[model samples]
Target: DALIHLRVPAEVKGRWVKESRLEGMKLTDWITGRVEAKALSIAEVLEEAAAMARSLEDSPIFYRNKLCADGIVTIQQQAARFSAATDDATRLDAALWAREGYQLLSSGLPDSYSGAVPNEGRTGWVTASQMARLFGGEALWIERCQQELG
Candidate 1:
């Protein structure tokens, strides 16, 4: 049972009343409907991730593994947090986390890896660099969250 009260100016209220009347809705009904339509729910987020994962499965194994493990997992984790959030701050943080996860998924793995040494054998730079980029993305995301949340 969520309720919101707004102390809008008389002019704004009059305009909204007129708009609602034009749309054949009560003022409160129209406002709430509009807000609900524009808002994203946890189920929507999970569905979006499911679609992304389906598409990612067609990608190369190396890329798919990193994306699913890092990006998809982050999105799922944050979406759960968002669903369980008890306060505005927690909800906001969850939103930010999901946003960053989406960005990471879209960006894919980094291309900064170089060839491995001969004697020491392959140092597995692909995996290492992928992880490094994941960490880097997390750092950037945290910085962004702090700036926006503060």
Candidate 2:
């Protein structure tokens, strides 16, 4: 039933988001990751907040090598440090705000994140493997959490 396409949107449909593959773990125990985005105002997140907000490019297009290179350097630096922030409970809460604030600083990405739609995946920036892989360091979380919650 989990993969059975519910023909529903989690926002509108009650609590079900696909059938749960998880057999146990309270919704709380299973853990969750959320990415928040600001409701309005750009300058606040771009120049006034985040401090880390800096652009390598003057334009969104990737044609300019100088800008593109700079941007890539920034991105790679940020991407590499990604793991340092993992393994935390508040990461999701940060992501949600970062999405909103960061988008104001600058939006979108240079490349497609696998098939993941922008900002759709947990933590927003990481197109991460399932929670099973990322959290448990293996597939153990899914099974353990499933049994625990179920």
Candidate 3:
């Protein structure tokens, strides 16, 4: 791999340390793993975007609350750890979630807000038992995802 240097603020180093610890890796490894994890082939992202367009056309509000409740799955490739067929399905599923998250953020609202107010016209799974069992203990990542989704 080529050496790519980056200059970051002092605060960024704090995140480097924290994430390294969480992943049980060195700062270098942690950062590298993150880059790799988030990497998507250009065609892949475009295809997912197209899938999202179709999904949104069918249900404009389907993913509105998904980002809030399960932002991890929205931002990260949840199916990356699963079988190929399952991974394809999971990737498309995640694409829809992310698509709506970005769509809501770009819904012409100013950036100072915390999140969208619950739309009276919207609805989704409410009961605790109805929720998917997604893993999420990373407060930093979760908060960032929520903010970007908004």
Off by over 4 Å in 3: 1-4, 41-96, 99-150
Q: Given candidate 1, what's the lDDT at residue 32? A: 70
User: Compared with the true structure, what per-residue lDDT tens digits does model 1 show for residues 14-85?
Assistant: 977864664456888766755543333434544455444344444453244566447656766776786677
For candidate 3, write residues 26-121 as lDDT tens digits.
Answer: 888756655553344423543443443334334434445444334323322332322132444454444345444433323422223233432211
lDDT of each: 0.53, 0.30, 0.38
Most TM-score-accurate candidate: 1
Instruction: Tell me how far the alpha carbon of residue 139 in candidate 3 is from the true structure, in angstroms, after superposition.
Output: 20
TM-score for each model: 0.37, 0.19, 0.32
What is the descending lDDT order? 1, 3, 2
Q: Kindly list the per-residue Cα lDDT of model 2 for residues 1-150, writing each as its tens digit.
A: 233343656664444231121223243222342112222222222222222332222233323334333443443343333224553333333323333333322343333434424333212222211211222221332333233323
Q: Identify the candidate with maximal lDDT.
A: 1
Q: Point out where model 2 deviates above 4 Å.
A: 1-64, 86-150
Whole-structure CA lDDT of model 3: 0.38
Error of 2 at 18 (Å): 34
Candidate 1: how large is its RMSD?
17.5
Clashes of 2: 13
